């Protein structure tokens, strides 16, 4: 029993070291991801500004701005981590995706899955739900190319091909270090927002049609960046929890091993003195 306790003490110490290293690495990558999120903000702001101008000049008839008369299919892009040790990140995202699916079904729409990250693929495969297309290997460090690919796929599916009459994106907002929240945004069809208070080439309509896909691509990129930041924050939290639990486990196992050491010494003494007393 003492051998098992000491082996478990060594195992828990190794796990504690690994989890602490993961926590510190996640602390570094949280800063990296937050800096990358902030680095993309100027592009989003400026493209949103000129998109608002073009909409002010556009006809507002693009398919991305008008609902299908009878909607049946609503694509859902569930952004999830591609590696574990992220605590409830994936669980929160997939629970919100299930909430969105229930909302869609209560409204009469049929959800069709687009997935980012291997964990979401596993979760949906276990539940016998098929995914039209899935990407992996960039939730830890997204690049604009992956966001462009996802946006092209979603937009083409919206234009259609069985196609989808709607599309939402379900991902983790990185509100702050301490808090992250799984949210769902309808990325199309887009609401035309009117708010109180230029020249265009080749014309406002063609330029706006070429801009809207780019706006969706940059918004999906921002979603991916915030997903990476939230994933790293959840990794830090989960790994600190794991380190604390491993430290508590090491304390408990050390206490048990010491009880067993004292018991072994006492029992050997009892046997020796039982032999001695009997001569």
């Amino acid at each position: 029993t003492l051998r098992e306790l000491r082996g478990r003490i060594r195992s828990a110490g190794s796990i504690k070291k690994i989890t602490k290293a993961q926590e510190l690495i996640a602390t570094s990558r949280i800063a990296k991801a937050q800096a990358r999120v902030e680095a993309a903000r100027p592009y989003a702001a400026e493209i949103t500004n000129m998109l608002t101008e073009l909409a002010g000049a556009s006809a507002l008839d693009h398919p991305l701005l008008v609902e299908r008369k009878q909607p049946k299919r609503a694509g859902v892009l569930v952004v999830s981590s591609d590696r574990g040790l992220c605590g409830a990140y994936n669980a929160n995202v997939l629970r919100r995706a299930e909430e969105l699916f229930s909302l869609l079904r209560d409204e009469g729409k049929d959800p069709v899955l687009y997935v980012v990250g291997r964990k979401a693929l596993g979760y949906f495969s276990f539940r016998q739900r098929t995914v039209v297309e899935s990407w992996t290997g960039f939730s830890e460090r997204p690049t604009y190319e992956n966001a462009r690919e996802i946006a092209d796929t979603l937009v083409n599916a919206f234009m259609a091909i069985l196609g989808v009459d709607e599309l939402h994106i379900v991902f983790t907002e990185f509100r702050s270090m301490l808090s992250q929240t799984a949210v769902a945004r309808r990325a199309a069809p887009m609401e035309v927002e009117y708010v109180g208070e230029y020249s265009f080439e080749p014309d406002p309509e063609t330029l706006f049609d070429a801009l809207l896909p780019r706006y969706i691509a940059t918004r999906v990129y921002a979603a991916l960046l915030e997903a990476a930041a939230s994933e790293s924050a959840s990794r830090r939290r989960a790994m600190k929890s794991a380190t604390d639990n491993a430290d508590d486990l090491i304390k408990a196992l050390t206490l048990a091993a010491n009880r067993e050491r004292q018991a072994q010494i006492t029992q050997e003494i009892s046997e020796i003195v039982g032999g001695a007393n009997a001569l």
Partner: protein, 233 residues
């Protein structure tokens, strides 16, 4: 035994704690000069437990039900007295500190407790199947305890995460508001007929209640009460 042999009555014989028998015999032994056994108990420990226990057995035509609390010293189920008394028992309910501290009364450890009539020939196929599926779920939950403790349920596979959820629900549903517990908590005690518990656990293992919160099953004692408390939450 007068009531059994002579009067021919069905006899209930409750002992609390039949460990204190052996412990007494230990002290006497230390004073009688007999050399100590494994951990200080008397050498005749098994002999005395045999002379005491095999008197409690039921003669052929005339029955004596018995139930005995057995204090395991220092929560050590390997102590010689509990180990000796295990061999004399048709049904054993091993209560545990771990299940006690979770608030799950009667604190029965499902995996260590056993009976000799939990046999498909005696209790039927449905009862045996439900009991053994519950035991399978609980054993799988026990096997994951280190991973649960370190990384939480998040790291497990889905086939195991669902199992962990319904294992927690089964573990808490095995709790019951005992009538003897009224004096401590104030809630009146509930009685669950066997058919209802078999059906409830068949439903619960299959996952038909894995959408309800855990607290719904805690100290609720039945399906009707389960739904009532689920509404309460």
């Amino acid at each position: 035994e007068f009531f059994r042999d002579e009067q021919g009555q069905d006899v209930l014989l409750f002992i609390d704690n039949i460990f204190r028998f052996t412990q007494a015999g230990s002290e006497v032994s230390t004073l009688l000069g007999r050399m100590p056994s494994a951990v200080g108990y008397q050498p005749t420990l098994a002999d005395e437990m045999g002379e005491l226990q095999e008197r409690i057995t039921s003669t052929r035509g005339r029955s004596i039900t018995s139930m005995q609390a057995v204090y395991v010293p220092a929560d050590d189920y390997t102590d010689p007295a509990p180990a000796t008394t295990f061999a004399h028992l048709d049904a054993t309910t091993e209560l545990s500190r771990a299940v006690f501290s979770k608030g799950i009364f009667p604190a029965v450890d499902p995996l260590a407790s056993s009976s000799t009539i939990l046999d498909p020939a005696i209790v039927g196929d449905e009862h045996y199947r439900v009991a053994q599926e519950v035991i399978r779920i609980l054993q799988r939950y026990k096997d994951l305890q280190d991973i649960i403790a370190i990384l939480g349920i998040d790291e497990l596979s889905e086939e195991d995460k669902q199992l962990v959820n319904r294992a927690r629900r089964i573990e808490r549903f095995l709790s019951q508001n005992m009538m003897a517990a009224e004096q401590f908590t104030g809630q009146p005690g509930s009685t669950v007929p066997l058919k209802e518990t078999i059906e409830a656990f068949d439903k619960l293992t299959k996952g038909e209640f894995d959408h309800l919160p855990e607290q719904a099953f805690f100290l609720i004692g039945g399906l009707d009460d389960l739904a009532k408390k689920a509404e309460s939450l």
